[PDB]
């Protein structure tokens, strides 16, 4: 019925708020925030009576002086939520001077949840049934309002009431407009004022029922002024709320093309969808804007200037976004950066065929070359002089070249060059030269032998674990004893473990920086040498602080001192994977329970925080809580209603393995000197679900429900502490009327006996009686008949009654509401 404006962001002034003068349905997010110098009298003549529907969210943060929201957005019906703000489709946060919400027309927040926090005067929040609006009511976060204490006077205008968690209270937005609730035969389509149902295609409301051409908010698609289930050819869906022809989607394209590609989405056409960017395995045509399939990850292709591309930092690496081959070479030289392992892998972790020479000269911040995730061929048609094809000198932190268990890399031409790498050891180069094919087809590499592999060790042996016994929380583990040829050289074992739910983790992964670690390291003292290879001596450790049912990666390495020839011994075992056992879980969190009939409860909860295994099923018990019998003794017509740290730095490690050689040198001097030579309740079992519809119940009797989450069933099942919740059923309306005519008994001294019988199936309790005798033409005087008076007298003795005919109305007030009045009880004497 109006124009379709885009999404704005209004702040610090109200003048931008004029741009909502004409638009009706917002194709964006509306966000009014941070208005300090605003008077509260600047909101009376400010109203937007055309806004119908919002498609992203609505945020309203710290607007001073806004009293109520019912004079600003009086015609919201649908907040779509195709995009959300931190999974919250309606945020009202730190908003002061706000009294009530008052959005008295919104019917369906489609996808998301509400967050209302930290207001100081926000009444009318416990009288909104969100389960008739939020289709996912489980995860709204409404705390710290004015209603943290039960203080505010949320009075209510005749307006229908329903149960939420037992508290059978009334529903209204304001003190003048109540919640438009519909019967559940018109589930989401929205009913009219009389109660007859509407067409099955529009959402929220409709002006005239049973016609999809006069609906005010359409759920599936909106085409040409009418509701449409799914748009006919040749139209295209657009932002999943409306349908456009080819010229709008197309036209939009040149719109962005012409705009610096700065704040626009080049819209393409794919499967009758005007899509922002069509995904991987697909290329955009340039003629008719379609997106055509390409076989596999299809090439860019990626040419470059002059063959040389010095990768100084990550911004220089922003030209190679998603290239596949390079028609040149690469020279990478990086010195510093932040989140570099993520940024370099996201930039150039898709390059496949380098057609030149790779050269990693003077890269200081490189710990490993594993960010080349898909490197497969280095052709080498342009070689570095000296005929090289992999040039590597002066990398101060290089430790791991690739992962040679799961990789392949062919350099068809050229030689290798590995100089001046301290931490990179000879084993990786000797593994690369026989996995690439350069020690075959024989071509003489130029690898220095003395200046590779210092301050480290890679001529190691290997340990073997022997006893891995797991528990639910702890794991003890023991390995083979190891002894270097001079048995005082060993200083201690170091055990690394880390949680890893996959099987691709290696040793030098995760740090990518100066000396950091993602592992957890513990130290083990060496055992006692009993001078016998057959003894109970081999060491071990007991890891304690774990979590049940996860996969841990564990390895262990020795710590030996350097011999005086530059010969480092030692052994690091293979990476092993262990799995802890299962344990009974915790309680299911925040169960809720709304009713919809006279004998039904539905439940909604959350899956538990730590499942500790594949949860097979749940288990739910319900028992009856009959009646609070101490409620039997209150006259209700008087007031109302009763109801550990361990870091090992470089200086400490060097001091330790210097003292542990000073002691060895002293006792070696002692052995040189002193030795001189000679010349019950029912149960239900719900599987793989988070809801349950209980049936076969009594009306308006509070049930207590216990919840269990049970993970393994067949071998003598075990599960958790039960979560407790209470529920109520919505009462029947007919069951409170007085059955039969009320009997009159006329005593002579002007006290009369009006006796009746209690209704044979009340809802909870019948607490009061309202009797009303009146002469037709005279005033009425109300009488409250208590439960105790009726119990003692089996009727009521009505004193102070002048003679004559009287119309008498009888009713019995129960805990639900009014029933109906009886016939006018005529006890008559002829004048």
């Amino acid at each position: 019925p109006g124009e379709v404006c885009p999404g704005m962001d209004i702040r610090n002034n109200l003048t931008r708020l004029h741009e909502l003068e004409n638009c009706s349905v917002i194709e964006g997010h509306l966000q009014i925030l941070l208005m300090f110098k605003t008077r509260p009298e600047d909101f009376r003549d400010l109203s937007f009576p055309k806004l119908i529907m919002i498609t992203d969210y609505l945020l309203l943060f710290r607007v001073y002086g806004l009293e109520s929201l019912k004079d600003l957005f009086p015609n919201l019906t649908v907040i779509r939520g195709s995009r959300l703000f931190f999974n919250y489709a309606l945020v009202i946060f730190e908003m002061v001077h706000l009294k009530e919400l008052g959005l008295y027309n919104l019917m369906n927040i489609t996808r998301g949840s509400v967050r209302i926090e930290k207001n100081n005067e926000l009444c009318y929040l416990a009288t909104i049934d969100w389960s008739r609006i939020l289709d996912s009511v489980e995860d709204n976060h409404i705390v710290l309002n004015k209603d943290d204490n039960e203080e505010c006077g949320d009075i209510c205008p005749n307006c229908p009431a329903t149960v939420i968690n037992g508290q059978f209270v009334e529903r209204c937005w304001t003190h003048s407009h109540c919640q438009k609730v519909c019967p559940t035969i018109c589930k989401s389509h929205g009913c009219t004022a009389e109660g007859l149902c509407c067409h099955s295609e529009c959402l929220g409301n409709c002006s005239q029922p049973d016609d999809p051409t006069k609906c005010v908010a359409c759920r599936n698609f909106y085409l040409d002024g009418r509701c449409v289930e799914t748009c006919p050819p040749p139209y295209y869906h657009f932002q999943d709320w409306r349908c456009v022809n080819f010229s709008f989607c197309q036209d939009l394209h040149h719109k962005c093309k012409n705009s610096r590609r700065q704040g626009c989405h080049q819209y393409v056409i794919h499967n009758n969808k005007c899509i922002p960017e069509c995904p991987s395995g697909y290329t955009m045509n340039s003629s008719n804007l379609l997106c055509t399939p390409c076989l596999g990850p299809c090439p860019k292709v990626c040419h470059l200037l002059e063959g040389e591309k010095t990768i100084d930092s990550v911004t220089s690496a922003q030209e190679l976004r998603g290239c596949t081959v390079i028609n040149g070479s690469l020279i990478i030289n990086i010195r510093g950066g932040n989140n570099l392992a993520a940024e370099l892998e996201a930039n150039l972790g898709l390059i496949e065929e380098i057609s030149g020479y790779l050269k990693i000269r003077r890269s200081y911040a490189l710990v490993s070359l594993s960010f080349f995730r898909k490197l497969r061929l280095i052709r080498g048609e342009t070689l570095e002089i000296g005929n090289y094809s992999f040039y590597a000198l002066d990398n101060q932190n290089l430790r791991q070249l690739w992962d040679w268990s799961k990789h392949n890399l062919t350099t068809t031409q050229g030689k290798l060059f590995f100089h001046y790498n301290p931490k990179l050891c000879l084993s990786e180069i000797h593994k690369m030269e026989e996995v690439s094919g350069t020690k075959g087809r024989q071509e003489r590499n130029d690898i220095a032998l003395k200046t590779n592999g210092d301050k480290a060790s890679c001529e190691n042996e290997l340990l073997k674990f022997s006893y891995i016994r797991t528990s639910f929380d702890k794991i003890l583990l023991r390995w083979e004893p190891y002894w270097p040829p001079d048995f005082r050289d060993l200083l201690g074992f170091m055990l690394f473990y880390k949680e890893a739910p996959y099987q691709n983790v290696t040793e030098f992964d995760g740090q990518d920086a100066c000396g950091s670690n993602s592992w957890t390291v513990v130290d083990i003292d060496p055992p006692l040498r009993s001078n016998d290879p057959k003894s109970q001596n081999h060491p071990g450790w007991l890891m304690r602080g774990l979590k049940p049912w996860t996969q841990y990666a564990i390895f262990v390495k020795t710590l030996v001192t350097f011999s005086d020839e530059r010969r480092t011994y030692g052994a690091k075992s293979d990476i092993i994977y262990v799995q802890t056992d299962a344990t009974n879980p915790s309680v299911p969190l925040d169960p809720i329970s709304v009713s919809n009939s006279s004998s039904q409860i539905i439940l909604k909860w959350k899956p538990p925080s730590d499942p500790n295994g594949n949860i097979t099923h749940y288990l739910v018990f319900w028992e009856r809580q009959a009646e609070d019998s101490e409620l039997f003794e209150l006259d209700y017509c008087l007031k109302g209603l009763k109801l550990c740290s361990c870091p090992k730095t470089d200086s400490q490690i060097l001091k330790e393995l210097e003292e542990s050689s000073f002691r060895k040198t002293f006792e070696d001097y002692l052995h040189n000197v002193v030795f001189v030579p000679r010349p019950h309740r029912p149960f239900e079992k719900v599987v793989n679900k988070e809801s349950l519809v209980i049936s076969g119940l009594r009306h308006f009797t509070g049930y207590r429900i216990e919840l269990q989450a049970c993970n393994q069933d067949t071998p003598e099942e075990r599960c958790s502490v039960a979560a407790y919740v209470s529920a109520r059923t919505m009462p029947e309306a007919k069951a409170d009327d007085i059955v039969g005519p009320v009997t009159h008994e006329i005593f002579e001294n002007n006290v009369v006996h009006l006796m009746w019988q209690e209704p044979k199936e009340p809802n909870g309790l019948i607490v009061l009686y309202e009797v009303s005798y009146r002469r037709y033409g005279d005033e009425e005087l109300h009488l409250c008949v208590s439960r105790k008076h009726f119990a003692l007298e089996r009727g009521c003795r009505l004193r102070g009654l002048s003679p004559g005919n009287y119309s008498v109305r009888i009713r019995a007030t129960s805990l639900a509401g009014n029933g109906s009045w009886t016939e006018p009880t005529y006890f008559y004497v002829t004048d």
């Binding site: 001079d486 070696d668 052995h671 040189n672 030795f675 001189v676 030579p677 000679r678």
Partner: peptide, 21 residues
């Protein structure tokens, strides 16, 4: 001495019966 010829090389029982009487 004795640690130099019995911790950098192997030792026979004749070589280490030389050190006592």
């Amino acid at each position: 001495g004795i640690v130099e010829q019995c911790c950098t090389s192997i030792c026979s029982l004749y070589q280490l019966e030389n050190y006592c009487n």
